[PDB]
Amino acid sequence: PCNYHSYLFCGLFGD
Amino acid sequence: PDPCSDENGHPRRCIPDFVNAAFGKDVRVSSTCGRPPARYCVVSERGEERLRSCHLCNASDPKKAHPPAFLTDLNNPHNLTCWQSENYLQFPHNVTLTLSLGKKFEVTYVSLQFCSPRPESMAIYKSMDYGRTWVPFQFYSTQCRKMYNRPHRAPITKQNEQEAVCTDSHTDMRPLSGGLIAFSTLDGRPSAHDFDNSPVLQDWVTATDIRVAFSRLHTFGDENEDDSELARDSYFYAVSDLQVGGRCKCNGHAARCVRDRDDSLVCDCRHNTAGPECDRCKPFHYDRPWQRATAREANECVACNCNLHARRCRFNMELYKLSGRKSGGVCLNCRHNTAGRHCHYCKEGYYRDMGKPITHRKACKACDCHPVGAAGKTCNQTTGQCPCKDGVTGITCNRCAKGYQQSRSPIAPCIK
Amino acid sequence: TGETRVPEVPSSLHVRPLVTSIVVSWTPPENQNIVVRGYAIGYGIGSPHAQTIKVDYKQRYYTIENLDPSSHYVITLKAFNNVGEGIPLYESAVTRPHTVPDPTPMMPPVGVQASILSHDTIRITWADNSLPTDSRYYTVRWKTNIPANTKYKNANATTLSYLVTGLKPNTLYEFSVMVTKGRRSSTWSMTAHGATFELVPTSPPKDVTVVSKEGKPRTIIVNWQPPSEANGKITGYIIYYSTDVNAEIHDWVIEPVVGNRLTHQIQELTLDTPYYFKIQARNSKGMGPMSEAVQFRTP
Ligand SMILES: O=S(=O)(O)OC[C@H]1O[C@@](COS(=O)(=O)O)(O[C@H]2O[C@H](COS(=O)(=O)O)[C@@H](OS(=O)(=O)O)[C@H](OS(=O)(=O)O)[C@H]2OS(=O)(=O)O)[C@@H](OS(=O)(=O)O)[C@@H]1OS(=O)(=O)O
Ligand SMILES: O=S(=O)(O)OC[C@H]1O[C@@](COS(=O)(=O)O)(O[C@H]2O[C@H](COS(=O)(=O)O)[C@@H](OS(=O)(=O)O)[C@H](OS(=O)(=O)O)[C@H]2OS(=O)(=O)O)[C@@H](OS(=O)(=O)O)[C@@H]1OS(=O)(=O)O
Ligand SMILES: O=S(=O)(O)OC[C@H]1O[C@@](COS(=O)(=O)O)(O[C@H]2O[C@H](COS(=O)(=O)O)[C@@H](OS(=O)(=O)O)[C@H](OS(=O)(=O)O)[C@H]2OS(=O)(=O)O)[C@@H](OS(=O)(=O)O)[C@@H]1OS(=O)(=O)O
Ligand SMILES: O=S(=O)(O)OC[C@H]1O[C@@](COS(=O)(=O)O)(O[C@H]2O[C@H](COS(=O)(=O)O)[C@@H](OS(=O)(=O)O)[C@H](OS(=O)(=O)O)[C@H]2OS(=O)(=O)O)[C@@H](OS(=O)(=O)O)[C@@H]1OS(=O)(=O)O
Ligand SMILES: *[C@@H]1O[C@H](CO)[C@@H](O)[C@H](O)[C@H]1NC(C)=O
Ligand SMILES: *[C@@H]1O[C@H](CO)[C@@H](O)[C@H](O)[C@H]1NC(C)=O
Ligand SMILES: *[C@@H]1O[C@H](CO)[C@@H](O)[C@H](O)[C@H]1NC(C)=O
Ligand SMILES: *[C@@H]1O[C@H](CO)[C@@H](O)[C@H](O)[C@H]1NC(C)=O
Ligand SMILES: [Ca+2]
């Protein structure tokens, strides 16, 4: 009902 | 058989057995009767009167001698054996006893059984280094202020438990023979209950050498009379039993201390650790930062995993922080054309051979991407396919597609 | 048999600490040539010198009684005959603390209902089935999830109701009550949730950042973050931009946007003019306060 019916990743980390 | 191994074979905290570290060990003293041979007098009190029995101390005769070896020898109530200091070595002059363990020990107690009456002023000293600098452990005096510059009957402060305390307890002249002074290292210390989690007290119990200094002796006040000889001969320091109790400091990673190749006492480290006190960690086991063992957690040193491609690994604090305090071991100089922290994948310009496992030498085959055909050098790791430009059918981007002819342009190698 | 020498060191020693006792177990020395008359147990806190118990040679185990609850004892075992006492064997143990049996708990309060009065006040009402004199008092607790890892605020009440004050507007709170009679006390009642009423924002939007867009320099993007005191569900944002700061709001051009978006692209901007920015937040009860202007010049 509320559900979605390839996954892409995004990263972010400090130095 | 091993105490470090559990019933299934899992790691568990290792503690060496409780031992009297002083037993059978050479003790260096400042004074001993017999050289030259001198007379000493034993005082005995019965009712309201005092009695004196004078004997001779001869260093050469075994039955008449009182050497420093008589402190550390077996204590027998039937046949007591005590060492005896030179006659009348009253304040400022002192009599000291230095004991060298030659290793870090977690001291629980330091006890002294006296043949002569207990001193008016005595102090226990320890050494963190192997005898270079000395730090006080405990003071015993009638006047803590005037003698040892410490407050009399001072209560143990939570702010500084690593400080030596002075008391008038155990200093009484009675008993004139058989008097005992036993110092409990964790006595009165507020956080002693949570010792396993308290490094402040863990450092307090640690000592490599123990020095006991006898500063002032008990007197009746008859030494300044007309006859000085008879009186001054009846005042001396004598100890039958010296016990330094405590376990070998191995930070919970060893069940026993063994003498090494250079005849030095060292812990027999376990849980993949190394060091004289198991303070550091064995090479190639830097996957987790070093931590002392507790009752609930074994705190074993975690081994590195390089998939048999690297011999040396290093600990990264940032990676350990990014893993959420799990693992932080990064392999150094990855061999067989591999890359990554755990040396698990093939480096750019190489691909994995599915016929052989990751642990094998020939785990990564060379990715021979054509310089004019392929777009990049880095290819597909599971299949071995170079990134082709203009829809090239070649595995290494070497042959033009159907209908396509080879071109002069470096941007477009195949033209339809 | 053999009294020519002092007895040898015992083979093994094993302790077992309890609440007020220590079970000691041992084994005689390996050498049988030297006769042994008995064993001497020496115990005490810190040092083993405190007390001594002498037993016969036949004995192999002994439980040391009448001890302190959480104390650290050092036990010493010696083998003795007619000539004297042998070489000791040491072991240390920490006695188990004295456990006090817990009382049978009471029935917790029932019918716990949260009644929202204002943005900072919620009244809590509970009942007690045990009540048909007593010196029993009720305790109330409440906590919001923001900030993180915060603890429940406690408050004592002698009556069947309590007025909660000093709360944040438009934020979900969890409430529960317990009854304490003495050593006997009941656990927390069923959790009742109460969400505060919305309010006019009391803080302006923070982190106002203006930067020149790479590609189309005539267009400059404005970036903002929501204020700390939002005091409710934000529906929109109002951006203000002008060449002069000293001029009032009526002179400044109004550029309102949607609340779910925190970015807005501004097109057709004048050349060689210093731009100043001010952002405000929108709510159902009112509008957010004014913020400090930022300096940004165009080439
Ligand atoms: O006044 S005396 O007769 O006692 O003269 C001193 C010499 O006595 C010895 C030997 O005892 S005696 O044969 O009874 O004279 O005394 C020392 O030994 C006895 C034990 O006797 S035994 O013959 O060695 O077996 C100890 O007595 S006791 O404690 O067992 O009751 C003495 O202790 S004490 O003086 O009472 O305190 C002990 O004396 S001492 O500590 O040595 O001074 C001879 O000593 S010995 O050589 O060690 O046996 C004394 O002769 S000596 O030539 O001065 O050495
Ligand atoms: O008698 S002496 O010549 O040996 O000197 C006495 C000095 O002891 C003090 C404190 O010494 S110190 O703090 O360690 O430097 O006596 C005063 O303090 C102790 C400890 O305080 S407390 O109340 O116990 O926590 C008190 O002793 S005791 O009662 O606790 O056992 C003293 O009280 S009492 O005389 O024992 O009854 C207390 O004395 S007073 O009530 O303060 O007068 C120093 O006294 S002080 O300087 O006045 O604080 C003395 O040192 S001094 O340099 O001679 O003054
Ligand atoms: O207040 S916390 O509960 O969050 O704990 C932080 C305190 O931990 C220390 C030392 O404690 S120890 O690790 O037991 O020896 O700092 C070090 O540990 C934390 C791990 O905390 S966590 O909640 O388990 O994650 C590290 O933080 S984190 O990176 O995992 O988030 C520290 O890293 S950092 O200093 O923030 O960069 C780590 O510090 S260090 O590598 O030892 O330098 C205490 O810090 S200390 O006093 O500087 O040693 C923290 O105590 S504090 O009171 O919060 O300052
Ligand atoms: O005497 S009984 O018949 O009641 O038997 C009790 C025996 O069990 C022990 C050891 O158990 S075991 O190590 O798990 O095999 O009791 C202890 O059990 C656990 C230890 O578990 S652990 O996995 O080794 O960590 C501990 O309880 S708990 O804290 O995890 O809840 C207790 O040990 S300790 O305080 O952590 O040191 C202890 O439980 S006790 O709390 O009630 O039972 C043995 O007791 S022991 O000698 O004190 O360690 C008993 O063994 S025995 O051979 O019967 O003497
Ligand atoms: C006892 O002392 C004298 C001191 O002159 C010494 O000559 C003698 O050798 C000593 N006794 C023994 C048994 O050595
Ligand atoms: C008995 O005591 C005397 C005291 O001088 C000592 O010489 C002797 O060696 C002791 N014997 C043992 C076995 O301890
Ligand atoms: C003991 O005497 C020595 C000198 O013989 C001196 O160095 C030391 O400070 C004195 N005091 C103590 C407590 O050792
Ligand atoms: C409630 O009362 C008890 C007993 O007087 C006290 O321990 C507790 O701190 C009180 N709590 C509050 C918030 O008043
Ligand atoms: Ca002795």
Author numbering:
A (entry chain C): 138 to 142, 159 to 168
B (entry chain A): 38 to 453
C (entry chain B): 764 to 895, 901 to 1067
Study text:
Neogenin (NEO1) acts as an attractive guidance receptor when the Netrin-1 (NET1) ligand binds, but it mediates repulsion via repulsive guidance molecule (RGM) ligands. NEO1 is a single-pass transmembrane receptor belonging to the immunoglobulin (Ig) superfamily, composed of 4 N-terminal Ig-like domains, followed by 6 fibronectin type III-like domains, a single transmembrane helix, and an intracellular domain. Secreted netrins comprise an N-terminal laminin (LN) domain followed by three laminin epidermal growth factor-like repeats (LE1-3) and a C-terminal Netrin (NTR) domain. Structural studies on binary NET1-DCC and NET1-NEO1 complexes have identified the three NEO1 membrane-proximal FN domains as the NET1 binding sites (Finci et al., 2014; Xu et al., 2014).
To understand how NEO1, NET1, and RGMB assemble into a ternary complex, we determined the crystal structure of the minimal ternary NEO1-NET1-RGMB complex, composed of NEO1FN456, NET1ΔNTR and the RGMB NEO1-binding region (RGMBCORE) to 3.25 Å resolution. Strikingly, this ternary complex is assembled into a 3:3:3 stoichiometry, composed of three 1:1:1 “protomer” complexes arranged around a 3-fold symmetry axis. The backbone of the “trimer-of-trimers” super-complex is essentially formed by interactions between NEO1 and NET1. NET1 is an elongated and rigid molecule, making contacts with two neighboring NEO1 molecules in order to bridge individual NEO1-NET1-RGM protomers within the super-complex. The NET1 LN domain (NET1LN) forms the major interaction site with NEO1, binding to NEO1FN4 (“Interface-1, ” Figure 3A). The combined buried surface area between NET1LN and NEO1FN4 is 686 Å2 and involves predominantly hydrophobic interactions, with NET1 residue F55 in the center. The second interface is formed by the NET1LE3 of the same NET1 molecule and a neighboring NEO1FN5 domain. In contrast to “Interface-1,” this interaction is of a predominantly hydrophilic nature with a buried surface area of 572 Å2 (“Interface-2, ” Figure 3A). The NEO1 FN5 and FN6 domains interact with RGMB, as observed in our previous structural analysis of binary NEO1-RGM complexes, via the high-affinity “site 1” interface (Bell et al., 2013). A total of 4 N-linked sugars and 4 non-covalently linked sucrose-octasulfate (SOS) molecules are bound at the complex surface.
